[PDB]
Amino acid sequence: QQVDPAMLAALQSQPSGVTPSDDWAAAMDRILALTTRNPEAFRQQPQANRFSAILEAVVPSRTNPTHEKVLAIVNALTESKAIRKDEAGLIYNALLERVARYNSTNVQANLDRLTTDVREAVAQRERFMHDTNLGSQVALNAFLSTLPANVPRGQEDYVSFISALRLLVAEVPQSEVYQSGPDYFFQTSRQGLQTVNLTQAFKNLQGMWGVRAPVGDRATISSLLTPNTRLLLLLIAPFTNSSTISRDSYLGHLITLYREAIGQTQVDEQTFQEITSVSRALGQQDTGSLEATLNFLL
Amino acid sequence: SKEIPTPYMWSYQPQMGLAAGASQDYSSRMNWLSAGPHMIGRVNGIRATRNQILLEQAALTSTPRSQLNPPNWPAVQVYQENPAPTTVLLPRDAEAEVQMTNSGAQLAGGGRSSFTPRQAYLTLQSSSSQPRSGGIGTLQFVEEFVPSVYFNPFSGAPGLYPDDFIPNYDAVSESVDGYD
Amino acid sequence: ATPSMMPQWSYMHIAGQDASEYLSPGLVQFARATDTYFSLGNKFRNPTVAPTHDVTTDRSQRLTLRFVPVDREDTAYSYKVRFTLAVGDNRVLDMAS
């Protein structure tokens, strides 16, 4: 939920009340009675909690940030799942033994360099959540360095389909591709369904890019296509404008018609939101509020 | 096998209202083992329709969310109950009725009354003070959680699988809270 | 209903069409003209469905319910009771039951 780990290190090892040992500029801010909200609040403390603050502010203490700088590292390693969460009580029990064994002027200044690049040079972790080359760009640029670029029929639409497929894994942060076994896959979401067999799809689409099929043929592709190729073309449909594969290829009978099939449900869901909200507006059997509703929409 | 899968059907939790972890559909399968080529290409042409009906039903009906089987539903994505404000008919407005008894007349029985001409009646809100969260009903589980057709099944990294298909898995602990 | 399973039903004739419809009507004209002779009509699977709406009341109704007398007259020869049979706006009777 947080952005930075060192703020949680500054939340688990700093005093919540204002002390002059660490925040002098706020502890002296209220001794001299110069504060906007509640100014006159330090005279009326007795000699117990005046001298226990007014001595320690005009000459500060000299504490040791060794126990605090390591929590800005041990947290920064468990935020990125390098360590198990069940385990950080051991490594801080081992790093604090480490940097007190080999302590110097250098290591106290070398940890302090390392609690800055886990703050402002950990912006790469903010970066490839957006560009998602975790598993979407550099894991697919091996796939595009695997397919043959010499297709006999349809030389131009072959390199515009994968030009529209690299855009698919780029405009979606959740989708990713990977190497499992001798073939590459592609899931549209983490914790997600609809895994396409990406090797067994472009091998099915090879020798298929030029057909120029007529518009009176529907039930032939049970022995020609494969339903995951029929689902990969479903996942390429919203990111494919009308200028990719124009009109008369058999993919124009597929990719354009898949956008119309998505174009049905992206307005009939708004119809389905109306019907399920008027069954309780007039009084309708909720068991029979979905049987006849779906049959009108399928 | 991998291409036309028999779909993972869920199971309903009546207590918590969450999804009880899905299972392979094992109670609607045809016994096509005693069939030659002209029907085992027809049976596979049937399952390839219910794996396409269930994908054109999952878009029309289910709420688009990331975590399928979430442990704590939000307030707005759960069906509430907002009936009409309950119009309450007050019988006898006592602003001039306590003056009648102090005049000396004891009352009994019970416009609405003859001694006073006016009759006010109030309305008040009949919904809850806060909307409901944490658990969907039965009819919401009729609506959402259509049987998830899982193509190219279990074909990725650990954690990239649907881990909620295990009917023991806490969705926010990465772990079965088992016997402890 | 439930089109999650409907093409899986109608191929095996669970719901869908009776033997008048799905058979090619050359065979329907064949079998109906020959019933004294050879009598097809067995082994062709006429299915039936239930009316999926208009039977079920999702509100917690009650199939059967006893009533209680609101009086009695213990005459030495007679015995008279009166009842208060009443319904919740949506429960018709036949009164022979």
List the resolution, Å. Answer: 4.0
Geometric angle at alpha carbon C48, from C41 and C27, rounded to 5°: 30
Residue type, B80: Q
Residues A120, A150: one domain?
no
Partner C contacted by A273 (CB < 8 A): no
Q: Which domain holds residue A281?
A: 135-298
Partner C contacted by B127 (CB < 8 A): no
- Reported as type and span, the H/E element at residue A186 is strand A183-187
Residue A220 in tokens: 């032939």
- Which residue's entry shows tokens 């969260």? B133
- Which residue's entry shows tokens 């002296």? A28
Number of CB atoms found within 10 A of residue A140's CB: 24
A250 closest CA partner among A154, A139, A126, A144: A154
d(C-alpha A158, C-alpha A208), whole Å = 10
Between chains, do B50 and C7 touch, taking CB under 8 Å as contact?
A: yes
Closest CA–CA distance from residue B87 to any residue of chain A (Å)? 18
The residues with which B12 forms a beta bridge, in sequence order, are: B19
Listed in sequence order, the residues at least 6 apart from B150 whose beta carbon sits closer than 8 Å to its beta carbon are A193, A195, B5, B7, B8, B162, B165
Residues A256, A172: one domain?
yes
On whether the CB atoms of residues B26 and A236 are closer than 8 A, the answer is: no
Where does a domain end: A82, A98, A131?
A: A131
Residue B145 in tokens: 């959680």
Residues A114, A171: one domain?
no
- Which residue's entry shows tokens 């005046």? A50
d(C-alpha A214, C-alpha A233), whole Å = 19
| Counts for chain A of helices (H) and strands (E), in that order | 14, 3
B137 closest CA partner among B78, B69, B95, B179: B78
Closest CA–CA distance from residue A288 to any residue of chain C (Å)? 6
d(C-alpha C46, C-alpha C40), whole Å = 12
Q: Is B150 exposed, middle or buried (0-12, 13-18, 19+ CB in 10 A)?
A: buried
d(C-alpha A114, C-alpha A110), whole Å = 6
Residues A111, A229: one domain?
no
Dihedrals φ, ψ of B8, to 5°?
-70, 110
Q: From the candidates C2, C9, C89, which should be mutated to test the interface with A, based on the most A CB atoms within 10 A?
A: C2
Dihedrals φ, ψ of A170, to 5°?
-100, -40
Residues A46, A88: one domain?
yes
A11 closest CA partner among A86, A20, A108, A2: A2
C-alpha dist (Å) from residue C38 to A189, A224, C21, C46? 61, 45, 21, 18
Residue A257 in tokens: 């018609």
The residues with which B23 forms a beta bridge, in sequence order, are: B9
- Reported as type and span, the H/E element at residue C73 is strand C73-74
Residue A265 in tokens: 């449900």
B134 closest CA partner among B177, B67, B62, B75: B75
Where does a domain end: A103, A131, A159?
A: A131
3-state secondary structure of A187: strand
Number of CB atoms found within 10 A of residue A183's CB: 14
The residues with which A180 forms a beta bridge, in sequence order, are: A183
**Residue A66 region by backbone torsions, left for phi larger than 0, else alpha for psi between -120 and 50, else beta:** alpha
On whether the CB atoms of residues B8 and B51 are closer than 8 A, the answer is: no
Task: Please report residues of C whose CB lies closer than 8 A to that of A288.
Answer: 52-54, 56
3-state secondary structure of C80: strand
Look at chain B and report how many structural domains it folds into.
1
d(C-alpha A43, C-alpha A38), whole Å = 12
Partner C contacted by A283 (CB < 8 A): no
d(C-alpha A114, C-alpha C19), whole Å = 80
Q: Which domain holds residue B136?
A: 1-180
Where does a domain end: A110, A131, A152?
A: A131
Dihedrals φ, ψ of B19, to 5°?
-90, 130
3-state secondary structure of C40: strand
d(C-alpha B153, C-alpha A179), whole Å = 15
**Strand duo B23-24 + B8-9: pairing:** antiparallel
DSSP C53: S
Dihedrals φ, ψ of A291, to 5°?
-70, -55
Partner A contacted by B63 (CB < 8 A): no
Residues A99, A205: one domain?
no
A86 closest CA partner among B158, B174, B162, B157: B174
State whether the Cα torsion B99-B102-B105-B106 is positive or negative.
positive
Residue B153 in tokens: 């099944």
Residue B42 in tokens: 């027809």
3-class SS string, chain B: CCCCCCCEECCECCCCCCECCCEECCCCCCCHHHCCHHHHHHHHHHHHHHHHHHHHHCCCCCCCCCCCCCCCCCCCCCCCCCCCCEEECCCCCCCCCHHHHHHCCCCCCCCCCCCCCCCCCEEECCCCCCCCCCCCCHHHHHHCCCCECCCCCCCCCCCCCCHHHCCCCCCCCCCCCCCC
Look at chain A and report how many structural domains it folds into.
2
Residue C44 in tokens: 């062709």
Give B117-125's long-range contacts (Cβ < 8 A, gap of 24+): B118/B93, B119/B90, B119/B91, B119/B92, B119/B93, B120/B90, B120/B93, B121/B87, B121/B88, B121/B89, B121/B90, B122/B88, B122/B90, B123/B85, B123/B86, B123/B87, B123/B88, B124/B85, B124/B86, B124/B88, B125/B85
Residues A12, A37: one domain?
yes
Helices (H), A38-87: 48-58, 66-69, 71-79
Residue A176 in tokens: 């990713």
d(C-alpha B38, C-alpha B33), whole Å = 13
B172 closest CA partner among A191, A105, C38: A191
Number of CB atoms found within 10 A of residue A259's CB: 18
- Which residue's entry shows tokens 């208060």? C84
Chain-centroid distance, C-alpha A206: 33
Residue A2 in tokens: 């947080």
On whether the CB atoms of residues A186 and A200 are closer than 8 A, the answer is: no
On whether the CB atoms of residues A139 and A177 are closer than 8 A, the answer is: yes
d(C-alpha A124, C-alpha A174), whole Å = 17
d(C-alpha B161, C-alpha B167), whole Å = 14
Listed in sequence order, the residues at least 6 apart from C5 whose beta carbon sits closer than 8 Å to its beta carbon are B28, B50
Q: From the candidates C6, C53, C56, C89, which should be mutated to test the interface with A, based on the most A CB atoms within 10 A?
A: C53
On whether the CB atoms of residues A240 and A257 are closer than 8 A, the answer is: no
